[PDB]
Design a protein around this nucleic acid. Structure first.
Lengths: 130, 159, 66, 108, 177, 26, 74, 145
RNA sequence: GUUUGACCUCAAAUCAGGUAGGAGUACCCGCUGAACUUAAGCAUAUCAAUAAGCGGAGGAAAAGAAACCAACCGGGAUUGCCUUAGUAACGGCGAGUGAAGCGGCAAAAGCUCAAAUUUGAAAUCUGGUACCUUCGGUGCCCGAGUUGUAAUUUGGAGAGGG
RNA sequence: GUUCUUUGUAAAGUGCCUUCGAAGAGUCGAGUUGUUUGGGAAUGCAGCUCUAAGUGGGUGGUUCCAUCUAAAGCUAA
RNA sequence: AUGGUGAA
């Protein structure tokens, strides 16, 4: 070759890259419980059977719980705004619990929300307050 | 030679009626970018520390106006004659005549732009109005229908 | 496939050619040529010759009437 | 004249590709849960094969939603139709069994 | 809105209204250059349904081509050479003469920051779309390449040279078949 | 001849409901 | 085709509105006169030659019949 | 008396071999009417109403290798389906055509349809060729020399 | 107002910020296109939807989420491999040319517009400039933009409310 | 893993009930002149003439039935 | 034959 002949001849050197070992021994990255329980001497499919978890959901072409309990372990384990709360205080002190009067009201209930909207927000308000 | 739906324009609204139309329309300016921004900072300074009805303005998008006529919500519709693609607005006088919404062809597209905070508008419409200008609006409707529509009933004909 | 409606079709569709001249008809009914007697039906040898004779001898029936 | 000298090479390529996908998609089984489908044409109708994707109907009958189905790794097809009754039953049972097996981790 | 009315108005092309617009514009476009920039698309409904937004970065070049290879693709190729920084998106017919045909080809500036942002159009910035018209990757190019789905397009679906090279070169395995 | 438009229109061309966004302040 | 293409009051309105505002094309201008003079028979002949297929020319002449009848009377 | 017209019509999809047959027979028939295109059946009667044609030849096209020709008459014609694998013509025929009504009726059709009326629009006085009609293996064979 | 002012259009500049050319070219995408040679002379078949030439890309390209294939107890984006198969089919049936659906596998991922009004408020973006935690954020000014920029929707429907 | 901040009557999702509900044209197609193929239902494309429809339109199967939704675009392996 | 270089 023309260009390769110069690169071998020059005193610049070549951008030598040794990256063939890393193409096989790939570290697991996305789960810490797996990161501890993964034998790199074994293959992909062999590591899955060792754990318990399925490696393939289809019937595979060709031929052929210590860890899974720890995954079930990690499976065992919103408020309202200041204006919204203060606005609900105005409605409750005015009417009480008359939602029909509350939604036919114009001065306090400006955005013409339904009975179901106002009462739901009042239930959340009655949890944080009286 | 012009096909009758073209040159249904150019037979536009006259001097005095157009002046009176803008006497109405210039009352109903949309709130400009600067004015709107300063109002919301006034709202920010007030409402953060310690009611209003719907404000009337002119409606000015071509899609918005073609919605409003046939809604039907438009009362007066102003239409510019000078449009770069004329075919954009040629159907619009016919649409207004069909739905029975009073329309007027105004002269000058930039003339519509002045009342509306834009460069050009091609179409402008006044959907709703304040109570004081209601009688004045309806009088202008009759004024436009007498001057524009009744004088040029033959505008659908003659090349 | 019934032959009742077939004969009803012979009533309405068919035109009487015998009332008119051979000029108006222009169709030689080359009868007595059954053509089931043709040898080698899959080789196409006698089928060529017997049809060619059926076509050419039909001209001489029309030739006198022309 | 092309020769496939790289038959051994490309199997090692494909295996290492699956190995990377295993490393990156750590607990998940590399491929999506595909349906069970009856093949077309008189010749092959006796054969029952892996289909492309389920359906909105099969997903809805299983007890989950279409957009959510894809996030849990169920392949969903929208152009496929549920004409057969036996195929519909087999796929619904396949999903319900799959839903008993899955363990969807929390987002916290 | 109006785009339904325009859509239907553009159907009746030889009708009185649109006939008159043709004979005025055909004269006007002959006064101007062969390749020149229109400020706004004359058929804006068509511009939209071919992917034009009236924002900074979109350009509508008007182009003139001779009558009697395809003319639509030639129209796009001519503007590609003149406006090299731009990327051809789509083109459409506007007007025609006995001698010439006119197209209003729509372009996008990939260099303009209003396009490098929004995700609906930032795909055109990717270097794989340099001269889409010079490779027949536009609407009319893909049409002339015979690329659709069906029995009709069997010999020219995924590259007519690709299917030829596949069919007329011997393939041999390690363990021979 | 302004033939179709002489018969003047009555209901609007749609039937779409108008949303609550066109009432309570925006 | 569950979503085949229902009537849609708006689309019907727009099509008929444009149908009159545009006017008539030169072949149609000839065609409507050809209906009134030479009958519907010869009208279908010219329309079939002008357009592609006869199935197009049927609905076309039928549309012309609707236009003429509605114009003169109402 | 013999005043008739022929009407060669075709369905979507005709080329090479079949269009050789359509175009050359349209050339050989001086009273032929070459039409653009058709797609389906009931319409064909109204096609005859246009040109006052006394005959019709409809080329239907189905399973990609075969051929399906439909021959019929204008007012109340009984159609017969087929499956085959500009001078004044002379029309030769067969004995086995007259053996049954099945072949006698199609003989009548082949006389005035595929032949010619003497008072044709493009009728030439000089003769050139013959028309061979005969039956072998339940099918017809036609060659023009 | 025989002034003046809106726009639209055409200009301008050694202004500010950019960008396109050329090289390489095995692969890919387009465009253009021979002849020696094969059947007997050569118009097709045949060299050949080749070689040369021209234009354009990338790490791949192209293709792609059906206006698809089918005729079945239906399949379900595309690409590639195995097979279908030297089969259907075409070819002075001859030099011969030569698929495709199905099936097995490789790899798998879907979505964005245009479409009916934000109209109780262009909710959007460019640029300049001032700072900041600078592949950017924020304030302010400017321009674009209603001949429609944002949000909401793409038939798998969807939206309005309850 | 470790924190610092999360807000606004904010942003969705799901089931039921109620009222509506627009999807691309000098394009589809038609005739013809060339190109493309081994393409028999000129396949595909281009040139030129004319040029549609919305209980629509395209493609296939023996009188109906099945199948998709063109004329806009993006996308790894 | 394709493409190029030279030339009373």
């Amino acid at each position: 070759s023309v260009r390769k002949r110069k690169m071998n001849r020059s005193s610049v050197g070549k951008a030598t890259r040794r990256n063939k070992d890393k193409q096989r021994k790939i570290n697991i990255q996305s789960n810490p419980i797996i990161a501890a329980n993964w034998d790199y001497s074994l293959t992909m499919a062999q590591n899955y059977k060792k754990l318990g978890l399925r490696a393939k959901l289809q019937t595979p072409a060709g031929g052929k719980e210590t860890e899974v309990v720890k995954k079930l372990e990690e499976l065992a384990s919103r408020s309202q705004s200041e204006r919204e709360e203060e606005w609900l205080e105005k409605l409750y002190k005015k009417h009480g619990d008359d939602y029909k009067k509350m939604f036919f009201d114009k001065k306090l209930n400006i955005y013409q929300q339904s009975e179901g909207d106002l009462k739901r927000r009042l239930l959340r308000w009655k949890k944080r307050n009286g | 030679k012009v096909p009758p739906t073209i040159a249904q324009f150019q037979y536009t609204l006259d001097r005095n009626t157009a002046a009176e139309t803008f006497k109405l329309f210039n009352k109903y300016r949309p709130e400009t970018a600067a004015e709107k921004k300063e109002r919301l900072t006034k709202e920010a300074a007030a409402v953060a520390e310690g009611a209003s009805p719907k404000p009337y303005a002119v409606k000015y998008g071509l899609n918005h106006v073609v919605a409003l006529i046939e809604n039907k919500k438009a009362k007066l519709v102003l239409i510019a004659n000078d449009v770069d693609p004329i075919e954009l607005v040629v159907f619009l006088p016919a649409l207004c005549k069909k739905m029975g919404v009073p329309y007027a062809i105004v002269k000058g597209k930039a003339r519509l732009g002045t009342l509306v905070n834009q460069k050009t508008s091609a179409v402008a419409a006044l959907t709703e109005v304040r109570a004081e200008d209601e009688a004045a609006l309806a009088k202008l409707v009759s004024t436009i229908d007498a001057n524009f529509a009744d004088k040029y009933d033959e505008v659908k004909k003659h090349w | 496939n019934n032959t009742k409606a077939m004969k009803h079709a012979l009533e309405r569709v068919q035109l009487p050619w015998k009332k008119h001249s051979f000029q108006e008809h222009q169709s030689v009914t080359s009868e007595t040529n059954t053509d089931e007697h043709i040898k080698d039906i899959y080789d196409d040898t006698e089928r060529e010759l017997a049809f060619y004779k059926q076509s050419l001898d039909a001209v001489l029936v029309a030739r006198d009437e022309l | 004249v092309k020769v496939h000298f790289d038959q051994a090479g490309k199997k090692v390529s494909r295996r290492n590709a699956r190995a990377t996908r295993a490393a990156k998609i750590a607990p998940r089984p590399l491929d999506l849960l595909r349906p069970v489908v009856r093949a077309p044409t008189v010749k092959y109708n006796r054969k029952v094969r892996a289909g492309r994707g389920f359906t909105l109907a099969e997903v809805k009958a299983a007890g989950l939603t279409a957009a959510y189905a894809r996030t849990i790794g169920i392949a969903v097809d929208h152009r496929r139709q549920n004409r057969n009754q036996e195929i519909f039953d087999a796929n619904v049972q396949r999903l319900k069994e799959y839903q008993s097996k899955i363990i969807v981790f929390p987002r916290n | 809105g109006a785009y339904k009315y325009l859509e239907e108005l553009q159907r009746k092309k030889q009708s009185d209204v649109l006939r008159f617009l043709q004979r005025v514009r055909v004269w006007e476009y002959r006064q101007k250059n062969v390749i020149h920039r229109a400020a706004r698309p004359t058929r804006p409904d068509k511009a939209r349904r071919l992917g034009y937004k009236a924002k900074q970065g979109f350009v509508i070049y008007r182009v003139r081509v001779r009558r009697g290879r395809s003319l639509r693709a030639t129209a796009e190729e001519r503007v590609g050479r003149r406006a090299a920084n731009l990327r051809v998106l789509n083109s459409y017919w506007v007007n025609q003469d006995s001698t010439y045909k006119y197209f209003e080809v729509i372009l996008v500036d990939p260099q303009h920051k209003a396009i490098r942002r929004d995700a609906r159009y930032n795909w055109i910035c990717d270097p794989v779309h340099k001269h889409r018209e010079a490779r027949g990757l536009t609407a009319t190019g893909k049409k002339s390449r015979g690329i659709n789905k069906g029995h009709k397009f069997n010999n020219t679906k995924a590259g007519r040279r690709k299917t030829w090279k596949r069919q007329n070169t011997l393939s041999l395995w390690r363990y021979r078949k | 001849i302004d033939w179709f438009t002489r018969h003047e229109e009555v209901m609007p061309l749609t039937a779409v409901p108008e949303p609550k966004r066109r009432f309570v302040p925006s | 085709s569950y979503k085949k293409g229902a009537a849609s009051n708006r689309t019907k309105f727009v099509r008929s509105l444009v149908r009159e505002i545009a006017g008539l094309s030169p072949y149609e201008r000839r065609l409507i006169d050809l209906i009134r003079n030479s009958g519907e028979k010869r009208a279908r002949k010219v329309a079939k030659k002008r357009l592609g297929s006869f199935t197009r020319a049927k609905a076309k002449v039928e549309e012309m019949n609707n236009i003429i009848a509605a114009s003169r009377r109402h | 008396m013999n005043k008739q017209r022929t009407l060669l019509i075709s369905s979507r999809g005709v080329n090479y071999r079949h269009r050789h047959l359509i175009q050359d027979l349209s050339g050989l028939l001086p009273h032929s009417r070459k039409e653009p295109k058709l797609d389906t059946l009931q319409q064909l009667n109204e096609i005859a109403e246009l040109y006052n044609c006394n005959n019709v030849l409809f080329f239907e096209a189905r399973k990609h290798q075969d051929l399906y020709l439909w021959l019929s008459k204008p007012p109340n014609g009984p159609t017969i389906k087929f499956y085959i694998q500009g001078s004044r013509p002379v029309l030769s025929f067969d004995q086995r055509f007259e053996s049954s009504p099945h072949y006698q009726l199609i003989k009548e059709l082949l006389v005035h349809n595929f032949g010619v009326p003497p008072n044709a629009r493009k009728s030439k006085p000089f003769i050139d060729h013959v028309m061979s009609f005969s039956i072998v293996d339940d099918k017809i064979w036609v060659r023009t020399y």
